[PDB]
Tab-separated table of C-alpha atoms and ligand atoms in Angstrom:
chain	number	residue	atom	x	y	z
A	8	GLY	CA	76.811	-1.207	268.594
A	9	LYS	CA	75.357	2.405	268.910
A	10	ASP	CA	71.759	0.861	269.661
A	11	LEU	CA	69.932	1.617	272.809
A	12	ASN	CA	67.232	-0.570	274.393
A	13	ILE	CA	64.915	1.536	276.648
A	14	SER	CA	62.271	-0.427	279.052
A	15	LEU	CA	59.259	1.825	280.351
A	16	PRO	CA	56.301	1.224	282.207
A	17	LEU	CA	52.697	2.661	281.242
A	18	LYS	CA	52.111	1.408	277.824
A	19	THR	CA	50.271	3.612	275.184
A	20	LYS	CA	47.586	3.125	272.871
A	21	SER	CA	48.184	5.974	270.482
A	22	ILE	CA	51.744	7.542	270.520
A	23	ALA	CA	50.564	10.884	268.746
A	24	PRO	CA	52.215	13.551	270.933
A	25	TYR	CA	48.970	14.990	272.194
A	26	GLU	CA	48.138	11.717	273.604
A	27	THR	CA	51.162	10.759	275.547
A	28	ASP	CA	54.518	12.495	276.647
A	29	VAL	CA	56.620	9.340	275.562
A	30	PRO	CA	57.625	11.220	271.924
A	31	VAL	CA	59.071	13.813	273.979
A	32	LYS	CA	60.790	11.452	276.692
A	33	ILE	CA	62.157	9.047	273.795
A	34	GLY	CA	63.611	11.926	271.489
A	35	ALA	CA	61.035	11.672	268.922
A	36	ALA	CA	59.325	15.181	269.344
A	37	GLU	CA	59.981	18.665	270.768
A	38	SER	CA	57.611	21.591	272.233
A	39	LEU	CA	58.187	25.030	271.250
A	40	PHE	CA	59.679	25.781	274.793
A	41	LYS	CA	61.196	23.339	277.443
A	42	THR	CA	62.299	23.302	281.183
A	43	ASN	CA	66.027	23.397	281.784
A	44	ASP	CA	67.695	21.393	284.153
A	45	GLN	CA	66.718	23.675	286.963
A	46	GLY	CA	63.036	23.634	286.052
A	47	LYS	CA	63.307	27.144	284.059
A	48	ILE	CA	61.117	27.890	280.992
A	49	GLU	CA	63.586	28.352	277.903
A	50	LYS	CA	63.019	28.798	274.233
A	51	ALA	CA	63.291	25.517	272.376
A	52	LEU	CA	62.354	25.629	268.949
A	53	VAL	CA	61.848	29.463	269.200
A	54	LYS	CA	64.251	31.996	268.296
A	55	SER	CA	62.574	34.921	269.873
A	56	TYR	CA	59.271	35.872	271.454
A	57	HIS	CA	57.335	38.907	272.705
A	58	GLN	CA	54.210	40.002	274.392
A	59	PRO	CA	53.385	43.522	273.502
A	60	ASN	CA	50.092	43.116	275.378
A	61	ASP	CA	48.272	40.644	277.762
A	62	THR	CA	46.411	38.964	274.898
A	63	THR	CA	49.125	38.632	272.187
A	64	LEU	CA	52.029	36.189	272.062
A	65	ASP	CA	54.481	36.883	268.799
A	66	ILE	CA	56.746	33.960	268.150
A	67	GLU	CA	59.689	33.833	265.666
A	68	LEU	CA	60.802	30.337	265.012
A	69	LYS	CA	64.434	29.342	264.450
A	70	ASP	CA	65.059	28.919	260.803
A	71	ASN	CA	67.518	25.950	260.805
A	72	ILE	CA	64.910	23.278	261.951
A	73	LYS	CA	63.429	20.536	259.864
A	74	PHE	CA	61.160	17.577	260.706
A	75	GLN	CA	62.611	14.136	260.327
A	76	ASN	CA	60.847	13.899	256.889
A	77	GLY	CA	63.042	16.700	255.786
A	78	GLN	CA	60.318	19.227	255.842
A	79	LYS	CA	60.871	22.712	257.265
A	80	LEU	CA	59.448	23.554	260.459
A	81	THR	CA	57.764	26.833	259.567
A	82	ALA	CA	55.049	29.068	261.523
A	83	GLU	CA	52.368	27.505	259.283
A	84	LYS	CA	53.372	24.037	260.415
A	85	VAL	CA	53.493	25.036	264.257
A	86	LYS	CA	50.094	26.708	263.767
A	87	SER	CA	48.454	23.493	262.065
A	88	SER	CA	50.068	21.293	264.702
A	89	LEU	CA	48.828	23.329	267.751
A	90	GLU	CA	45.361	23.528	266.178
A	91	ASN	CA	45.321	19.851	265.382
A	92	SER	CA	46.238	18.885	269.008
A	93	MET	CA	43.813	21.363	270.570
A	94	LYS	CA	40.954	19.641	268.600
A	95	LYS	CA	42.026	16.182	269.149
A	96	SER	CA	43.000	16.431	273.014
A	97	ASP	CA	41.067	17.697	275.885
A	98	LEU	CA	44.436	18.241	277.883
A	99	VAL	CA	45.815	20.336	275.282
A	100	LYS	CA	42.599	22.191	274.612
A	101	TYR	CA	42.001	23.088	278.367
A	102	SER	CA	45.686	24.034	278.873
A	103	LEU	CA	46.069	26.288	275.693
A	104	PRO	CA	42.825	29.004	275.659
A	105	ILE	CA	44.002	30.088	272.245
A	106	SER	CA	41.510	32.415	270.331
A	107	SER	CA	43.389	32.556	267.163
A	108	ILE	CA	46.513	31.889	265.420
A	109	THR	CA	48.031	33.658	262.374
A	110	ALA	CA	51.306	32.552	260.556
A	111	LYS	CA	53.936	33.809	257.957
A	112	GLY	CA	57.254	32.580	257.279
A	113	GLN	CA	58.989	31.811	260.758
A	114	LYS	CA	56.686	34.201	262.627
A	115	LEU	CA	53.343	33.234	264.156
A	116	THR	CA	51.325	35.422	266.399
A	117	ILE	CA	49.118	33.700	269.093
A	118	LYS	CA	46.123	35.418	270.384
A	119	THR	CA	43.762	34.992	273.509
A	120	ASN	CA	40.499	36.718	274.375
A	121	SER	CA	41.834	37.484	277.898
A	122	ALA	CA	45.195	37.504	279.955
A	123	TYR	CA	46.375	33.858	280.449
A	124	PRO	CA	49.841	34.315	281.985
A	125	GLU	CA	50.494	30.456	281.853
A	126	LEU	CA	50.252	30.367	277.905
A	127	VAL	CA	53.982	30.149	277.241
A	128	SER	CA	54.696	27.848	280.107
A	129	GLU	CA	52.002	25.357	278.891
A	130	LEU	CA	53.507	25.706	275.398
A	131	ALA	CA	56.387	23.792	276.986
A	132	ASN	CA	53.957	20.992	277.750
A	133	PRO	CA	54.996	17.648	276.135
A	134	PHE	CA	51.616	17.072	275.012
A	135	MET	CA	52.031	20.168	273.044
A	136	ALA	CA	54.804	18.883	271.029
A	137	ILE	CA	54.971	19.915	267.453
A	138	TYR	CA	54.660	17.368	264.625
A	139	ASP	CA	53.920	17.566	260.698
A	140	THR	CA	50.272	17.428	260.378
A	141	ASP	CA	50.891	16.833	256.411
A	142	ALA	CA	53.053	13.851	256.953
A	143	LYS	CA	51.570	10.918	254.964
A	144	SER	CA	51.454	8.667	257.984
A	145	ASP	CA	49.365	7.756	260.887
A	146	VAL	CA	50.273	10.297	263.534
A	147	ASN	CA	48.958	7.710	266.202
A	148	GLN	CA	51.657	5.174	264.974
A	149	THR	CA	54.557	7.014	263.576
A	150	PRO	CA	54.374	10.787	264.000
A	151	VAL	CA	56.856	13.038	262.559
A	152	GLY	CA	58.673	15.347	264.745
A	153	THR	CA	61.824	17.392	264.852
A	154	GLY	CA	63.290	15.497	267.564
A	155	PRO	CA	66.840	13.560	267.195
A	156	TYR	CA	65.252	10.222	266.874
A	157	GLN	CA	62.382	9.262	264.100
A	158	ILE	CA	59.837	6.861	265.028
A	159	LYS	CA	60.125	4.264	262.203
A	160	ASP	CA	57.772	1.489	263.605
A	161	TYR	CA	55.146	1.034	266.341
A	162	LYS	CA	53.923	-2.304	267.596
A	163	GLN	CA	50.596	-0.839	269.446
A	164	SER	CA	51.059	-1.047	273.423
A	165	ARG	CA	54.466	-3.230	273.020
A	166	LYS	CA	57.403	-1.681	271.078
A	167	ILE	CA	58.713	1.512	269.484
A	168	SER	CA	61.584	1.629	266.970
A	169	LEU	CA	63.363	4.786	266.367
A	170	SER	CA	66.196	5.767	263.969
A	171	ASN	CA	68.945	8.610	264.246
A	172	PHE	CA	67.814	11.859	262.385
A	173	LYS	CA	71.047	13.072	260.983
A	174	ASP	CA	69.770	16.394	260.151
A	175	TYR	CA	68.485	17.153	263.835
A	176	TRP	CA	68.841	20.657	264.289
A	177	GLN	CA	70.859	20.705	267.514
A	178	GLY	CA	73.659	18.423	266.161
A	179	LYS	CA	74.152	15.011	264.845
A	180	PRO	CA	72.518	12.316	267.341
A	181	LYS	CA	74.705	10.001	268.913
A	182	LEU	CA	72.985	6.715	268.914
A	183	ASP	CA	72.165	4.704	265.606
A	184	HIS	CA	68.894	3.139	266.783
A	185	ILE	CA	66.590	3.062	269.861
A	186	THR	CA	64.112	0.490	270.634
A	187	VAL	CA	61.480	1.207	273.524
A	188	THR	CA	59.479	-1.858	275.068
A	189	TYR	CA	56.888	-1.344	277.459
A	190	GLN	CA	57.091	-3.548	280.952
A	191	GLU	CA	54.457	-2.827	283.388
A	192	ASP	CA	56.059	-5.017	286.284
A	193	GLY	CA	59.053	-2.915	287.804
A	194	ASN	CA	60.793	-6.314	288.796
A	195	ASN	CA	60.852	-7.339	285.358
A	196	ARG	CA	62.353	-4.085	284.004
A	197	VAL	CA	65.203	-4.688	286.509
A	198	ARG	CA	65.703	-8.450	285.454
A	199	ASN	CA	65.860	-7.298	281.872
A	200	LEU	CA	68.454	-4.514	282.645
A	201	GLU	CA	70.358	-7.005	284.954
A	202	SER	CA	70.579	-9.594	282.015
A	203	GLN	CA	71.152	-6.665	279.364
A	204	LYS	CA	67.986	-7.184	277.309
A	205	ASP	CA	67.530	-3.464	278.416
A	206	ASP	CA	70.157	-0.765	278.662
A	207	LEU	CA	67.895	1.883	280.366
A	208	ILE	CA	64.701	1.611	282.462
A	209	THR	CA	62.727	3.824	284.582
A	210	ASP	CA	60.648	3.723	287.710
A	211	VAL	CA	62.826	1.065	289.393
A	212	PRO	CA	61.456	-0.386	292.379
A	213	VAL	CA	62.873	0.813	295.619
A	214	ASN	CA	63.747	-2.512	296.961
A	215	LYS	CA	65.797	-3.198	293.958
A	216	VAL	CA	67.979	-0.207	294.343
A	217	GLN	CA	70.712	-1.809	296.388
A	218	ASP	CA	70.946	-4.669	294.105
A	219	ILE	CA	71.642	-2.340	291.304
A	220	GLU	CA	74.061	-0.077	293.124
A	221	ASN	CA	75.971	-2.991	294.083
A	222	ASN	CA	76.486	-3.935	290.452
A	223	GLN	CA	79.484	-2.385	288.729
A	224	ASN	CA	77.990	-2.858	285.366
A	225	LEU	CA	74.990	-0.713	286.251
A	226	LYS	CA	74.390	2.582	287.784
A	227	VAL	CA	71.148	4.181	289.462
A	228	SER	CA	70.243	7.720	289.431
A	229	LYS	CA	67.686	9.232	291.679
A	230	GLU	CA	66.048	12.647	291.608
A	231	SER	CA	63.434	13.914	293.951
A	232	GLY	CA	61.220	15.662	291.591
A	233	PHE	CA	57.507	16.508	291.407
A	234	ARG	CA	55.768	13.516	291.119
A	235	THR	CA	53.155	12.700	293.778
A	236	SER	CA	51.471	9.357	294.709
A	237	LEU	CA	47.876	9.415	295.804
A	238	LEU	CA	44.457	7.738	296.482
A	239	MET	CA	42.050	9.095	293.897
A	240	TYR	CA	38.397	8.989	295.091
A	241	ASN	CA	35.416	8.526	292.749
A	242	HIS	CA	33.058	11.575	293.503
A	243	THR	CA	30.480	10.147	291.381
A	244	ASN	CA	29.707	7.562	293.332
A	245	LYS	CA	27.371	8.703	296.078
A	246	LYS	CA	28.612	6.314	298.763
A	247	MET	CA	31.991	8.206	298.513
A	248	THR	CA	30.855	10.800	301.076
A	249	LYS	CA	33.224	13.338	302.885
A	250	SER	CA	33.005	11.182	305.943
A	251	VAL	CA	34.451	8.228	303.875
A	252	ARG	CA	37.042	10.217	302.089
A	253	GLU	CA	38.205	11.500	305.700
A	254	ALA	CA	38.112	7.928	306.997
A	255	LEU	CA	40.378	6.518	304.311
A	256	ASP	CA	42.789	9.530	304.675
A	257	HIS	CA	43.174	8.500	308.347
A	258	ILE	CA	43.717	4.895	307.522
A	259	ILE	CA	46.730	5.887	305.392
A	260	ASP	CA	50.062	5.884	307.373
A	261	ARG	CA	52.056	8.222	305.245
A	262	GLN	CA	54.843	8.412	307.563
A	263	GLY	CA	55.265	4.725	307.538
A	264	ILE	CA	54.924	4.448	303.855
A	265	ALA	CA	57.709	6.853	303.148
A	266	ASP	CA	59.994	5.052	305.622
A	267	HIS	CA	59.034	1.465	304.665
A	268	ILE	CA	57.512	0.940	301.494
A	269	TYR	CA	59.672	3.998	299.739
A	270	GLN	CA	62.374	3.063	302.229
A	271	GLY	CA	63.283	6.720	302.467
A	272	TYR	CA	63.023	7.622	298.700
A	273	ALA	CA	59.806	9.888	299.456
A	274	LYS	CA	58.476	12.352	301.837
A	275	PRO	CA	54.880	12.192	303.365
A	276	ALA	CA	52.411	14.120	301.530
A	277	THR	CA	49.793	16.751	302.293
A	278	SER	CA	48.764	18.898	299.324
A	279	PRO	CA	49.638	17.835	295.546
A	280	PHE	CA	52.808	19.679	295.758
A	281	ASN	CA	56.193	18.642	296.867
A	282	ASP	CA	56.935	20.860	300.217
A	283	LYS	CA	60.451	21.662	299.112
A	284	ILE	CA	58.723	24.265	297.030
A	285	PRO	CA	59.205	27.334	299.334
A	286	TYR	CA	56.051	29.340	298.547
A	287	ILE	CA	53.624	26.427	299.133
A	288	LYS	CA	51.680	26.517	302.406
A	289	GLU	CA	50.765	22.839	303.041
A	290	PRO	CA	48.033	21.690	305.190
A	291	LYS	CA	48.388	19.866	308.377
A	292	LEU	CA	50.058	16.322	307.845
A	293	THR	CA	47.340	13.674	308.574
A	294	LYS	CA	48.364	11.071	310.782
A	295	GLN	CA	47.098	7.373	310.894
A	296	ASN	CA	44.461	7.079	313.117
A	297	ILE	CA	42.213	3.816	312.947
A	298	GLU	CA	39.826	4.895	315.907
A	299	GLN	CA	39.044	8.182	314.181
A	300	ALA	CA	38.252	6.339	310.871
A	301	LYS	CA	35.877	3.917	312.682
A	302	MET	CA	34.399	6.747	313.949
A	303	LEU	CA	33.755	8.490	310.570
A	304	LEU	CA	32.569	5.434	309.052
A	305	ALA	CA	29.727	5.311	311.948
A	306	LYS	CA	28.588	8.865	310.655
A	307	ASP	CA	27.336	6.773	307.552
A	308	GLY	CA	26.089	3.730	309.330
A	309	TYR	CA	28.892	1.197	308.846
A	310	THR	CA	29.736	-1.563	311.291
A	311	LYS	CA	31.849	-4.818	311.546
A	312	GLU	CA	28.602	-6.484	310.594
A	313	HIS	CA	27.739	-4.274	307.879
A	314	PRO	CA	31.277	-2.764	306.599
A	315	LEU	CA	31.989	-0.097	303.911
A	316	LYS	CA	33.057	-2.008	300.668
A	317	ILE	CA	35.489	-0.450	298.447
A	318	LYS	CA	36.583	-1.348	295.074
A	319	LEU	CA	40.202	-0.133	294.971
A	320	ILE	CA	42.148	0.085	291.344
A	321	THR	CA	45.834	-0.339	291.370
A	322	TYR	CA	48.463	-0.860	288.460
A	323	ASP	CA	52.065	-1.979	288.188
A	324	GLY	CA	53.705	1.097	286.489
A	325	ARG	CA	54.576	2.722	289.640
A	326	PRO	CA	56.027	-0.198	291.630
A	327	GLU	CA	54.966	1.198	294.921
A	328	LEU	CA	51.333	1.937	294.509
A	329	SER	CA	50.175	-1.533	294.848
A	330	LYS	CA	52.430	-1.991	297.881
A	331	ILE	CA	50.681	0.670	299.324
A	332	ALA	CA	47.241	-0.605	298.230
A	333	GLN	CA	48.005	-3.943	300.156
A	334	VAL	CA	48.710	-2.283	303.538
A	335	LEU	CA	45.663	-0.018	303.068
A	336	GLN	CA	43.477	-3.180	302.378
A	337	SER	CA	44.871	-4.772	305.666
A	338	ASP	CA	44.552	-1.591	307.613
A	339	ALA	CA	41.097	-0.503	306.557
A	340	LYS	CA	39.833	-3.915	307.856
A	341	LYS	CA	40.500	-2.553	311.193
A	342	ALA	CA	38.227	0.158	310.463
A	343	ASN	CA	35.240	-1.971	309.208
A	344	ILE	CA	36.338	-1.284	305.591
A	345	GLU	CA	36.336	-4.450	303.246
A	346	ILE	CA	38.642	-3.150	300.172
A	347	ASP	CA	38.821	-5.230	297.137
A	348	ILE	CA	41.945	-4.426	295.163
A	349	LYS	CA	41.721	-4.716	291.505
A	350	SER	CA	45.141	-4.444	289.379
A	351	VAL	CA	44.554	-3.248	285.862
A	352	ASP	CA	47.072	-3.277	282.890
A	353	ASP	CA	45.514	-0.148	281.173
A	354	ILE	CA	44.829	2.264	284.176
A	355	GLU	CA	43.834	5.283	281.927
A	356	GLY	CA	41.389	3.255	279.882
A	357	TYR	CA	40.063	1.531	282.989
A	358	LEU	CA	39.277	4.553	285.080
A	359	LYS	CA	37.018	5.798	282.057
A	360	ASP	CA	34.225	3.856	283.475
A	361	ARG	CA	33.185	5.483	286.379
A	362	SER	CA	30.709	2.695	287.379
A	363	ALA	CA	33.808	0.021	287.784
A	364	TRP	CA	35.825	1.765	290.466
A	365	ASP	CA	35.375	3.550	293.897
A	366	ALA	CA	38.949	4.815	294.471
A	367	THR	CA	42.214	4.253	292.639
A	368	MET	CA	45.884	4.357	293.357
A	369	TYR	CA	47.529	7.145	291.186
A	370	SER	CA	50.413	9.083	290.476
A	371	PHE	CA	50.764	12.336	288.825
A	372	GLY	CA	53.340	15.032	287.903
A	373	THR	CA	51.693	17.853	289.687
A	374	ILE	CA	53.932	20.746	288.817
A	375	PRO	CA	56.220	20.136	285.902
A	376	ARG	CA	56.713	23.698	284.864
A	377	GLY	CA	56.946	25.729	288.016
A	378	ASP	CA	53.111	26.636	288.355
A	379	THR	CA	50.307	25.003	290.339
A	380	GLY	CA	47.798	26.124	287.523
A	381	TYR	CA	48.244	23.377	285.451
A	382	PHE	CA	47.324	20.813	288.161
A	383	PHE	CA	44.258	22.515	289.204
A	384	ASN	CA	42.923	23.029	285.796
A	385	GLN	CA	43.343	19.372	284.893
A	386	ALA	CA	42.771	17.690	288.072
A	387	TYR	CA	40.084	19.750	290.011
A	388	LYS	CA	37.862	21.360	287.226
A	389	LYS	CA	35.261	19.424	285.753
A	390	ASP	CA	36.302	17.498	282.475
A	391	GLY	CA	40.218	18.226	283.248
A	392	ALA	CA	42.106	15.418	281.816
A	393	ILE	CA	43.314	14.111	285.039
A	394	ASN	CA	40.206	14.255	286.895
A	395	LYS	CA	39.157	10.916	286.771
A	396	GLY	CA	36.912	10.810	289.922
A	397	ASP	CA	35.017	14.200	288.729
A	398	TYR	CA	36.010	16.195	291.696
A	399	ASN	CA	34.156	19.728	291.452
A	400	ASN	CA	33.424	22.386	293.887
A	401	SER	CA	32.212	25.880	292.535
A	402	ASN	CA	34.069	27.622	295.343
A	403	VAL	CA	37.275	26.270	294.169
A	404	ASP	CA	36.574	26.499	290.485
A	405	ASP	CA	35.896	30.285	291.133
A	406	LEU	CA	39.456	30.612	292.765
A	407	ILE	CA	41.061	28.715	289.878
A	408	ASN	CA	39.370	30.811	287.083
A	409	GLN	CA	40.540	34.127	289.127
A	410	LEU	CA	43.988	32.277	289.107
A	411	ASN	CA	43.989	31.708	285.638
A	412	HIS	CA	44.152	35.433	284.698
A	413	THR	CA	46.235	36.669	287.572
A	414	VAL	CA	49.693	37.861	286.472
A	415	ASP	CA	51.316	38.998	289.498
A	416	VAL	CA	53.405	35.817	290.660
A	417	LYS	CA	52.983	36.903	294.416
A	418	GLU	CA	49.192	36.926	293.982
A	419	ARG	CA	49.236	33.653	291.909
A	420	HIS	CA	50.878	31.856	294.928
A	421	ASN	CA	48.560	33.349	297.263
A	422	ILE	CA	45.619	32.261	295.477
A	423	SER	CA	47.132	29.103	294.891
A	424	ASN	CA	47.639	28.446	298.586
A	425	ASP	CA	43.778	29.570	298.997
A	426	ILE	CA	42.768	26.770	296.611
A	427	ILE	CA	44.918	24.280	298.461
A	428	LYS	CA	43.302	25.418	301.843
A	429	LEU	CA	39.967	25.410	300.681
A	430	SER	CA	40.128	22.008	298.606
A	431	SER	CA	41.883	20.262	301.230
A	432	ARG	CA	38.742	20.347	303.279
A	433	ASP	CA	36.745	18.336	300.850
A	434	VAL	CA	39.775	15.773	300.568
A	435	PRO	CA	39.108	15.514	296.946
A	436	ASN	CA	42.323	13.055	296.873
A	437	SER	CA	44.431	11.851	299.580
A	438	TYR	CA	48.002	12.564	298.641
A	439	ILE	CA	50.382	10.127	300.150
A	440	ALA	CA	54.132	10.720	299.235
A	441	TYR	CA	56.313	12.953	297.216
A	442	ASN	CA	58.212	10.174	295.692
A	443	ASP	CA	61.779	10.143	293.962
A	444	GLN	CA	61.901	9.158	290.292
A	445	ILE	CA	64.609	6.218	290.105
A	446	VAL	CA	66.351	5.473	286.884
A	447	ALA	CA	68.654	2.605	286.265
A	448	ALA	CA	71.128	2.154	283.241
A	449	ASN	CA	74.066	0.060	282.206
A	450	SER	CA	77.173	1.918	283.144
A	451	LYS	CA	78.006	2.288	279.322
A	452	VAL	CA	75.069	4.698	278.818
A	453	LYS	CA	75.661	8.047	279.227
A	454	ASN	CA	74.029	11.698	279.096
A	455	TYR	CA	70.253	10.758	279.521
A	456	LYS	CA	68.247	13.165	281.507
A	457	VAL	CA	66.909	12.559	285.076
A	458	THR	CA	65.770	15.903	286.041
A	459	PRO	CA	63.045	17.166	288.409
A	460	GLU	CA	60.145	17.436	285.880
A	461	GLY	CA	60.048	13.736	285.268
A	462	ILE	CA	59.419	14.084	281.405
A	463	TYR	CA	62.678	14.129	279.603
A	464	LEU	CA	65.044	11.196	279.122
A	465	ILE	CA	66.843	10.898	275.741
A	466	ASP	CA	68.267	13.815	273.740
A	467	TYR	CA	70.834	14.132	270.807
A	468	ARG	CA	73.610	13.567	273.567
A	469	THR	CA	72.434	10.522	274.942
A	470	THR	CA	74.885	7.861	273.815
A	471	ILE	CA	76.849	4.556	274.346
A	472	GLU	CA	80.398	4.232	275.428
B	1	LIG	N1	48.984	9.328	285.466
B	1	LIG	C1	49.123	8.019	285.965
B	1	LIG	C2	48.829	6.894	285.071
B	1	LIG	C3	49.220	6.943	283.587
B	1	LIG	C4	49.292	6.113	282.582
B	1	LIG	N2	49.775	6.682	281.440
B	1	LIG	C5	50.271	7.710	281.838
B	1	LIG	N3	49.887	7.991	283.101
B	1	LIG	C6	50.726	7.916	286.000
B	1	LIG	O1	51.580	8.500	285.574
B	1	LIG	O2	51.217	6.855	286.937
B	2	LIG	N1	52.069	10.227	282.816
B	2	LIG	C1	52.261	11.715	283.092
B	2	LIG	C2	51.387	12.464	282.050
B	2	LIG	C3	49.973	12.215	282.093
B	2	LIG	C4	49.027	12.807	281.739
B	2	LIG	N2	47.931	12.068	282.118
B	2	LIG	C5	48.084	10.864	282.886
B	2	LIG	N3	49.276	11.090	282.775
B	2	LIG	C6	51.943	12.093	284.625
B	2	LIG	O1	51.119	11.220	285.307
B	2	LIG	O2	52.078	13.246	285.079
B	3	NI	NI1	50.379	9.907	284.179
């Protein structure tokens, strides 16, 4: 009827908003701010805000908003939500250097100790979505949000059931129910869509695009976006030296990968950030050189008789990562590296054991809100939430720390390009491709979001015709 079936990769454990962006993606939760279809920060739950000085953020909330349990969205509710999320998530905590919050009625005041220009931006982060901390349910299973669809049931790591929240503040949502099921294999997601088991899928494997495009019952939406695929190194393993990272960097054939593995739905990467961003000064493009790699590995004493052994992790959720892994393995052998590929079902959990991997295929949304600061803080600082390999360089730290209190946007761009230049010399990770998000749906599904931030999907206008 008006029921939507969605199939996603990257199964969750907790679906608390501070653990995963899935609640924002599927329409259950909303952040104070958002980015619009053109990537600009906008007020969402906020009616007005002011910044009377560089340590004060005054927010007035809209007065017509309720949580899905009927409770009013007030400043005290936003205060308790933000404080809980900071307390429970390192990602949130490190993105929000908030020193204190006061609340009365619909107005809250957020204070910092010093200037943090990216505060408002990070309040648009989906991990900062607002939920009812007083709700009498487990926030890890059925958080209560302000979004158009309330989570009614959660089968852990498998299925999310949502129902229309009729009093949703923007208007009456257009679906009755939504069912979200996790499926890590991209080919399976496509088969599910083709057999109408599901109506809407993300992360379509590039080699299935043509098959879906030929189907008049289906439609494919591609978006160039700001997601980057990479080879992430484990810097806590002493064998993963600069020579080894440089060697592996030169075993990658980025242009070949973009042309043949992504079949043109990607561009070769240099820095974390898509080169279509005008102010980014990219480092030189690394071209595959097996002899150079072989040479570098001689610096650490590796030979055909005594090769470097690398345990490389991968996962199915982003369909092209394991295809890249396969050709890295084949090519690395020519450079006296024996790569063992291990595909895992729960990548975030697996990487927590730093003794269990040397490198990993990975993918990250490196600039979801128009600023490079988020990535540097989460990926290049010790204990940042996506710094799985524990990359840290005090010289890079210093620039990131300076960036964090830099207000002038032109100066931000300059410091950012300095960080890119300096960090690139370490080869903290090998960035492989800026690749398109590809979404496919039954032709009767209308008005879902496929926009460059790669976060949003469902809103109150998404429907079935
Ligand atoms: N950050 C990786 C792994 C992940 C699992 N869940 C969320 N992320 C990716 O998005 O592909
Ligand atoms: N899956 C999203 C969000 C995330 C946070 N941590 C890991 N992933 C990304 O990779 O950008
Ligand atoms: Ni991720």
